[model samples]
Target: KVFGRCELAAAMKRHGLDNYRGYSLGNWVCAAKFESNFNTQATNRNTDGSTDYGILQINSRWWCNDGRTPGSRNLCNIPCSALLSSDITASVNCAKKIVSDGNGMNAWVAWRNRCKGTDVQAWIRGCRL
Candidate 1:
């Protein structure tokens, strides 16, 4: 993982994550940990034939184009490979756009299954946010 929990939290702050779209910084960190463990190059091909990419595990079906995936929605207008780089800015921007669609973090199954209604504060504990 490229980021320690605290380091990722600090980076989120630099991106102005405080109260972003009504999500706590803890919520973002919790979803990132569950999705990719802060590994920017994370990728997972799921049973549903969708590939999740990057620290947010954005899906190719709706968010990004994987080139191989025909008819991908490409809502983020980004290539799936772009999200796998160490630069998280694009991934963050896409995630914000997803949340802006009124789904919040529920767009990520990991966030819905692992973080929703859970004690998310621990994800950023000891991080000087």
Candidate 2:
């Protein structure tokens, strides 16, 4: 599912991503725009043999298990396929774990480059949430 900007913002807030780890919901919404374009089925294979999955582009190297990433920690304790579902519960949960692990939102390069120091609130403006 490719969500509209405000729609994605509402969903992320529903999943408790708002203000999670001191990061605003706009930051998350912005990261998703760059990471996956709000597409639930987005996936990217890295040259290093790891794959990123889902709306937030969670990685196989340390988060989800794809049975192909070498030495995967599977810290999210979920199959990588779970992240691809339009139902973003698993993706949101895994992302929370990532931030809770002290990695912060910087775990995603897209967030660091595009959302970290920007006026992320713009991403959610006009959304009646």
Candidate 3:
């Protein structure tokens, strides 16, 4: 989706994630970068065959419903397709739920391995927030 960083930052802020629920905007931006490089349609297959969906890579096993992935909890109550859209509202809402589920950003391995405790100002660089 090659969206501009400022646009993303503004959208995230508008969605109330700028610094909500203990996650900073940088953390979300860094997670998006590492998980899918900001591609809303990004998906990845796991060894177990489940898919990671959308910018934050919400998993088919838990957050979204993908018929191919068995035992999907669909806790986010959304179709996987919804997360693939360029509009991030659905994905952001799902991500907020995932974070509230006690995983925080740890739900995304990328956030755990890359963004946690790291200086992520660069993720928002040049963004007029």
Candidate 4:
């Protein structure tokens, strides 16, 4: 499912991403817009043979086990396919784990390049919550 910007914002907030680890909901919303355009099933394969899956683009190499990545850590202890579900709960949970790993939102290069250090509040502009 492809979510509207505000829709995804609300969803992320519902899952407790708002100000999680000092990163605001706007930061997360911006990352999702840049990473997957809020498409729940989005997937991208990296040159290293690892894949990024779902809305937050959780990577297979270190986060989820896809059984195809050359050296998967599966630190999130979830199947990569779980990240693609439209429900988005698993993706949100894994994303929290990713940020908690000391990288914060920098865990996603998309966030680093596009969202970090920017006026992220624009991503959530006009949203009621």
- Tens digits of per-residue lDDT, candidate 3, 1-129, equal 756677888889899997778888988998888889888889889998899988788889888889998766889999999999889999999988988987677888988999998997778888877
Question: Model 1: C-alpha RMSD to truth?
Answer: 1.3
Model 1: how far residue 67 lies from native, Å: 0.4
Residues 1-129, candidate 1, lDDT per residue (tens digit)?
467889988888788775789888899988898889889989999886889998989999899999877677999998899998777888888888899998777888888999999988888888776
lDDT of each: 0.86, 0.93, 0.86, 0.91
* Predicted structure 3: lDDT: 0.86
Q: For candidate 3, list the clashing residue pairs, or say none.
A: none
Residues 29-114 of candidate 2 have per-residue lDDT tens digits of: 99999999999999999999999999999999999999999877899999999999989999999999998987798888999998
Error of 1 at 4 (Å): 0.6
What alpha-carbon RMSD in Å does predicted model 4 have with respect to the real structure? 0.9
**Every model: Cα RMSD to truth:** 1.3, 0.8, 1.1, 0.9
Which parts of model 3 have CA positions greater than 4 angstroms off? none
What would the TM-score be for candidate 3 when compared with the true structure?
A: 0.94
Model 2 residue 57 lDDT? 95
